[PDB]
Write a protein that binds this ligand. Structure first.
Ligand SMILES: *[C@@H]1O[C@H](CO)[C@@H](O[C@@H]2O[C@H](CO)[C@@H](O[C@@H]3O[C@H](CO)[C@@H](O)[C@H](O[C@H]4O[C@H](CO)[C@@H](O)[C@H](O)[C@@H]4O)[C@@H]3O)[C@H](O)[C@H]2NC(C)=O)[C@H](O)[C@H]1NC(C)=O
Ligand SMILES: *[C@@H]1O[C@H](CO)[C@@H](O[C@@H]2O[C@H](CO)[C@@H](O)[C@H](O)[C@H]2NC(C)=O)[C@H](O)[C@H]1NC(C)=O
Ligand SMILES: *[C@@H]1O[C@H](CO)[C@@H](O[C@@H]2O[C@H](CO)[C@@H](O)[C@H](O)[C@H]2NC(C)=O)[C@H](O)[C@H]1NC(C)=O
Ligand SMILES: *[C@@H]1O[C@H](CO)[C@@H](O)[C@H](O)[C@H]1NC(C)=O
Ligand SMILES: *[C@@H]1O[C@H](CO)[C@@H](O)[C@H](O)[C@H]1NC(C)=O
Ligand SMILES: *[C@@H]1O[C@H](CO)[C@@H](O)[C@H](O)[C@H]1NC(C)=O
Ligand SMILES: *[C@@H]1O[C@H](CO)[C@@H](O)[C@H](O)[C@H]1NC(C)=O
Ligand SMILES: *[C@@H]1O[C@H](CO)[C@@H](O)[C@H](O)[C@H]1NC(C)=O
Lengths: 49, 585, 579
């Protein structure tokens, strides 16, 4: 698709999950795909109920 | 009405988990209290649940997903109170598959009438048609806002002839309706007709049905029982609370010039009056964390701001990244001993949210002096107390907590948490609790009782926060400070006491202990049944006074045969043995 | 360009000799009048050119008992009617017989409240030719007009070029403009018969274009050229975050426009309103002044005439003078009339005595005016008010005067402490014995560009010289309130206890003193006089150069105390060994 894996100096952006991605988009745009139990822009919060 | 999200292109789980989360949040939502974010949605998603959204408080983001149409036919107002990149209220980016099998071709925003703040960004969409056929300046309120609508489609069809060159799609049902760029020169806003006498009211948003302050889709400021106004009635009068006019301010908010606010201005303090609190012209500005503040969690660089804090003006969040560190910002892990800085806090005005705690701490004893949790600011919706997934905690420990002023409780998934089963929440959470507790997946009652993890026999039917005396909400018989007892030392015991408000208080040091009756009726020198030593008027003393300076200068008294004290002769030195001149020392 | 006008109705001028100058000082340079515009009792061919700039009157316009042929108000656009002349009238033209021949009100297109009363003017032409219905606002009004046509003059018809024969005068420039009764659809105001000529709904008099920036006069408030329904709040509210904030663009409400601060002599409020009187359950607090709310029972306040229980009371009398005992600031005015110092056979009230006037000895500030038209013949001055510093003039006598003295047997004013006249004119006339008026630096008492002193019929300057009446030779710049060394405005030498002298007795004399800034003060009784040198450094026993009696180390003392101390060989006090 339109995403690639974060470089080793960038991978610490996402927490708890670690699935950090970069948008291929002139400024840098950081994504993370969180585990089922985590949410928020960096996966920092638990999912309720 | 539903809460919004703030994920910034991040997603939770796989394609089906992402759809089910999006579906449940917006299933029957009319007004989004935050942002509307649709990111990485699959081509097989049924998005018809979005047909009921009419108003969005923040921004609308649709990015890197594939589906033919965006079904928002009833969205009129985007308020833009939160703006993506600081520029754009509507953000549409890269919505097509790189193999061209699926892509977003139509937005279907046929009723979008006003954007009150921010611009429009629609860029890099190879199959998205009719974006250069929309008069976006008829929709955007702010003349200085940036609009970027460029690389969208190549071989797109023309608009239907009835659309007059402006449309959302290839048909009459998709034509754009203009409300501002077709007005009489006098209106300076949206209209409901071409005549100078058909302009909408200044206080109305999203278009109007007539020229009045009630014939409007949405209000720009306050809604006063159907009327849109720039301010609520001033000295009948009404209070300004969250975009509506109300007869009285909620009990958990403080009044500042007829407005209800979460906290007072920098130059005012909260003062208790009759029922409600008011802001008056201060104490240390101990600000909280979470949404609306500078940081998301208590951490190794943030916890120092709570030294000598008694009242937190905001929320108190403990997230995993505030305990184990955060390498992305070079923040070291938090020293568990520094959590004792919260033992001085008596009130939190917002919510208390604990998602992680140190592995060697089995309770929350650092909050044992906490008496009130406020509901002025809630975690998402409803919840003002949140304790979840703490796998080493066996008791709550909130000894002093007597009131939660508003909101809901979320205590769940704490596999070791035990004593809370006995806790009578109706005496802690103000108002009805049947629909507000949500307590699930903690240590089973079966195993909690079977292992003997229950509260002391002197503890009342109100319940408790832990295993021992002083952790109960109330006790069956008497207290001695925090700790509860079977009885007071009134008629027996080495120290002796008296009753006051079901607590035991000691008798004056000079009080004579009684046998068969109460030793004293108070802690004073004049509240005892008998004097242990010498009597000086109504007060019992260890000896008669000598060298005392009063209204007439030095005062000296002598004891009698019954140990009562009497004044010495007016011509004595440093005392006497009697009332006569020859009795002087 | 803003002034408050007058409040005379049909009453006679206080001073017919200065009446035209009173009107000229209040109105010369004004474009907006905050009160009533009253042009009454004018002489034939009066110099009325100072009225040509007025565009707005917030109250009523009264023109009455004048001998002048025309009044130059061609620029007046709007009369708002916030105060009405009698029952439901905003424009009143009465008994102008010389007399008026033409109204010439060319610019007048709007009256927001009240009718038109034009009666007994047996020279006026066109009062019955004007379509007064186009001038009355669209909003519901009684819109009553009483037009007297008994002009007794052969007036020419409106210029042959005047469409519909509607005009203010005999010339082609005098035609009435129609801006309401000729508009398309529902428009209250327009430039012409087309829908495209309609004015913005916040315009009052009319407009030069369709926008709320094109109005000739604003219907509600003028926000720096933009006509708006409300003036921007000082403090705003966020409905999404539940917080209050200061507004960087917030403004104060003053008359019918927005300002960044209240004008001098006006009290600010927490809602942005600029007022003269604080609302109920508030206090007046200084910094510039503002009104603040009471968080506990409000402090005791002294009130004068026109305020609270004295609103209907005309003057201070023996039945109310005791209400000012112990007061420093009076909220209201003071008036002393012939009725104050004489008897009242109907109310059974005794006359005031000179000994009762002493209740004002503690008075420092008056919020209204000071009007004295009677005063005891045994008092050669106004020394009862020698401690009066500030007269605010928030309430003015007849709407114009804050300090007025009429017909008093006074030799000099004597108002020593007076340093400010916050607003209003000063009127001093018919005081046949009064000399010290030209000796007062009146230019240092006034604050507003529209203030001046008006005087006539007082003691001539040549008689002041012939009787030897002049300022004491120590008075700075020759400025004084009376002939005595205690009555200078300021002095070149030493001030003592409010009495100017050439020398402070520091180096010579039986008593000895010390200098502190411009004042000369006595030394402590225990200080030893030094012949040709300094005796003390201040008023205390421990500030002496040498002791007159005994030296007790912490201070000079008459005798050693009996702690028990004894005099030693050097003249000092030491603790005794016997205790
Ligand atoms: C709302 O408030 C605004 C701002 O206060 C107000 O606009 C102002 O109107 C006055 C009206 O006189 C303007 O004053 C002019 O200033 C220019 C400066 O060069 C002068 O040349 C003008 O002189 C004319 O009038 C004189 C009167 O005697 C004549 O002698 C002379 O020959 C000229 O004809 C005049 O003094 C002022 O400049 C503006 N201010 C701004 C910022 O535009 C407005 O009128 C208020 N009302 C409405 C409905 O908007
Ligand atoms: C102003 O607030 C009132 C409620 O006090 C709104 O009236 C409600 O509107 C919803 C819209 O679907 C209806 O379902 C409710 O039944 C209405 N309530 C009542 C009592 O009629 C009104 O629409 C709001 N107006 C604006 C512009 O926001
Ligand atoms: C313990 O819990 C019960 C509910 O299980 C509480 O019962 C309340 O009893 C009062 C008696 O007048 C009723 O008015 C309330 O409506 C009842 N509450 C509910 C939710 O039904 C009882 O108050 C609690 N006891 C203590 C000591 O906390
Ligand atoms: C306030 O903070 C300082 C920081 O060292 C601390 O020493 C002091 O004891 C605190 N005061 C109180 C009342 O706790
Ligand atoms: C709270 O935790 C401490 C941690 O060592 C523990 O010693 C204590 O037993 C716990 N207290 C209660 C009342 O459960
Ligand atoms: C209140 O705070 C002090 C601070 O150390 C603590 O010792 C005490 O146990 C607290 N009281 C309760 C009831 O938890
Ligand atoms: C006043 O005007 C009326 C208008 O018709 C007239 O009849 C009446 O005679 C006039 N009064 C006098 C004294 O002329
Ligand atoms: C008073 O007069 C003297 C004359 O030299 C001058 O120095 C001083 O500044 C004056 N003070 C005032 C308040 O006018």
């Amino acid at each position: 698709s339109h995403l690639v894996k974060c470089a080793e100096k960038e991978k610490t952006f996402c927490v708890n999950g670690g699935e950090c991605f970069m948008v291929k988009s002139n400024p840098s745009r950081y994504l993370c795909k969180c585990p089922n139990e985590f949410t928020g822009d960096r996966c920092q919060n638990y999912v309720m109920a | 009405v539903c809460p919004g999200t703030l994920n910034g292109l991040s997603v939770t789980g796989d394609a089906e988990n992402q759809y089910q989360t999006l579906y449940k949040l917006y299933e029957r939502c009319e007004v989004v209290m935050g942002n509307l974010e649709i990111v990485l949605t699959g081509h097989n998603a049924d998005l018809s649940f979005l047909q009921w959204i009419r108003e969005v408080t923040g921004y609308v983001l649709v990015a890197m997903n594939e589906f033919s149409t965006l079904p928002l036919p009833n969205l009129r107002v985007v308020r833009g109170t939160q703006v993506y990149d600081g520029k754009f209220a509507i953000f549409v980016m890269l919505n097509y598959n790189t193999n061209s099998s699926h892509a977003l071709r139509q937005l279907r925003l046929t009723q979008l009438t006003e954007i009150l703040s921010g611009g429009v960004y629609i860029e890099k969409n190879d199959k998205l048609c009719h974006m250069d056929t929309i008069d976006w300046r008829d929709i955007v309120r702010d003349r200085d806002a940036e609009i970027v609508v460029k690389d969208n489609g190549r071989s797109c069809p023309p608009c239907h002839e009835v659309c007059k060159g402006r449309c959302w799609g290839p048909g009459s049902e998709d034509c754009q309706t203009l409300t501002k760029t077709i007005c009489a020169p006098q209106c300076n806003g949206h209209c409901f007709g071409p005549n100078p006498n058909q302009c909408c009211h200044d206080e109305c948003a999203g278009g109007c049905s007539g020229p009045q302050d009630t014939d409007c889709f949405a209000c720009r400021h306050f809604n006063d029982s159907g009327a849109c106004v720039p301010r609520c009635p001033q000295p009948h009068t009404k209070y300004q609370y969250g975009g509506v006019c109300v007869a009285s301010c909620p009990h958990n908010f403080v009044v500042d010039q007829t407005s209800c606010v979460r906290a007072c201005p920098p130059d005012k303090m909260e003062v208790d009056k009759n029922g409600l609190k008011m802001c008056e012209p201060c104490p240390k500005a101990c600000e909280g964390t979470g949404s609306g503040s500078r940081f998301q969690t208590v951490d190794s660089s943030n916890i120092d701001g709570f030294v000598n804090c008694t009242k937190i003006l905001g929320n108190l969040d403990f997230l995993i990244t505030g305990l184990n560190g955060d390498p992305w910002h070079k923040i070291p892990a938090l020293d568990p001993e520094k959590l004792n800085v919260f033992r001085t806090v008596r009130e939190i005005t917002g919510y208390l949210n604990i998602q992680s705690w140190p592995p060697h701490m089995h309770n929350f004893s650092v909050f044992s002096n906490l008496t009130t949790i406020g509901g002025r600011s809630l975690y998402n919706r409803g919840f003002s107390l949140l304790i979840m997934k703490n796998l080493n905690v066996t008791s709550l420990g909130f000894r002093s907590l007597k009131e939660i002023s508003a909101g809901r409780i979320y205590i769940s998934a704490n596999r070791q948490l035990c004593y809370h089963h006995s806790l009578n929440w109706t005496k802690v959470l103000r108002g009805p609790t049947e629909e507000r507790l949500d307590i699930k997946h903690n240590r089973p009652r079966r195993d909690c009782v079977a292992e003997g993890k229950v509260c002391d026999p002197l503890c009342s039917s109100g319940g408790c926060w832990g295993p021992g005396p002083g952790q109960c909400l109330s006790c069956r018989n008497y207290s001695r400070g925090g700790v509860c007892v079977t009885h007071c030392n009134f008629l027996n015991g080495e120290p002796r006491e008296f009753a006051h408000e079901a607590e035991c208080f000691s008798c004056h040091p000079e009080c004579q202990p009684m046998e068969g009756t109460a030793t004293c009726n108070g802690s004073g020198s004049d509240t005892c049944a008998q004097c242990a030593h010498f009597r000086d008027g109504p007060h019992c003393v260890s000896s008669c006074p000598h060298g005392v300076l009063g209204a007439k200068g030095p005062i000296y008294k002598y004891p009698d045969v019954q140990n009562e004290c009497r004044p010495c002769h007016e011509n004595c030195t440093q005392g006497c043995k009697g009332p006569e001149l020859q009795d002087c020392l | 360009q803003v002034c408050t006008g007058t409040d005379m109705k049909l009453r006679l001028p206080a001073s017919p000799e200065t009446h035209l100058d009173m009107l000229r000082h209040l109105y010369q340079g004004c474009q907006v009048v905050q009160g009533n515009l009253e042009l009454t009792y004018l002489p034939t061919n009066a110099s009325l050119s100072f009225l040509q700039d007025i565009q707005e009157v917030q109250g009523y316009v009264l023109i009455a008992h004048n001998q002048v042929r025309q009044v130059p108000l061609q620029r007046l656009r709007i009369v708002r009617g916030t105060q009405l002349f009698e029952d439901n009238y905003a424009l009143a033209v009465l008994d102008n017989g010389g007399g008026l021949r033409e109204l010439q009100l060319r610019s007048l297109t709007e009256i927001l409240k009240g009718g038109v009363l034009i009666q007994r003017n047996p020279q006026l032409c066109y009062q019955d030719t004007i379509l007064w219905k186009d001038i009355f606002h669209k909003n519901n009004q009684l819109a009553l007009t009483l037009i007297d046509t008994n002009r007794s003059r052969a007036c020419h018809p409106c210029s042959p070029m005047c469409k519909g024969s509607r005009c203010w005068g005999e010339s082609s420039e005098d035609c009435q403009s129609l801006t309401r009764t000729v508009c398309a659809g529902g428009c209250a105001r327009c430039k012409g018969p087309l829908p495209t000529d309609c004015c913005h709904e916040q315009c009052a008099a009319g407009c030069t274009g369709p926008k709320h920036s094109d109005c000739l006069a604003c219907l509600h408030f003028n926000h720096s050229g933009i006509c708006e329904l409300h003036c921007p709040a000082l403090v705003t509210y966020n409905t999404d975050t539940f917080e209050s904030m200061p507004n960087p663009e917030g403004r104060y409400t003053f008359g019918a426009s927005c300002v960044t601060a209240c004008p001098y002599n006006y009290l600010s409020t927490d809602v942005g309103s600029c007022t003269l009187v604080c609302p109920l359950h508030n206090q007046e607090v200084t910094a510039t002044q503002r009104c603040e709310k009471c968080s506990k029972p409000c402090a005791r306040v002294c009130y004068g005439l026109g305020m609270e229980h004295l609103r209907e009371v005309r003057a201070v009398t023996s039945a109310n003078i005791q209400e000012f005992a112990g007061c420093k600031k009076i909220f209201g005015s003071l008036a002393f009339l012939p009725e104050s110092f004489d008897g009242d056979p109907a109310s059974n009230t005794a006359p005031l005595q000179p000994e009762q006037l002493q209740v004002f000895e503690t008075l420092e500030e008056i919020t209204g005016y000071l009007y004295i038209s009677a005063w005891p013949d045994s008092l050669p001055d106004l020394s009862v008010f020698q401690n009066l510093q500030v007269i605010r003039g928030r309430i003015l006598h007849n709407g114009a005067y804050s300090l007025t003295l009429q017909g008093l047997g006074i030799s000099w004013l004597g108002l020593r402490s007076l340093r400010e006249l916050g607003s209003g004119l000063a009127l001093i006339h018919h005081n046949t014995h009064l000399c010290f008026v030209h000796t007062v630096p009146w230019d240092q008492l006034f604050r507003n560009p529209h203030q001046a002193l008006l005087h006539t019929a007082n003691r001539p300057e040549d008689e002041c010289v012939g009787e030897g009446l002049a300022c004491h030779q120590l008075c700075a710049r020759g400025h004084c309130w009376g002939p005595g060394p205690t009555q200078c405005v300021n002095c070149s030498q030493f001030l003592r206890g409010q009495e100017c002298v050439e020398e402070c007795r520091v180096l010579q004399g039986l008593p000895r003193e010390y200098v502190n800034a411009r004042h000369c003060l006595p030394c402590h009784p225990e200080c030893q006089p030094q012949n040709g040198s300094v005796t003390c450094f201040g008023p205390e026993a421990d500030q002496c150069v040498a002791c007159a009696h005994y030296k007790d180390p912490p201070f000079c003392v008459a005798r050693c105390p009996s702690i028990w101390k004894f005099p030693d060989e050097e003249g000092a006090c030491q603790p005794c060994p016997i205790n």
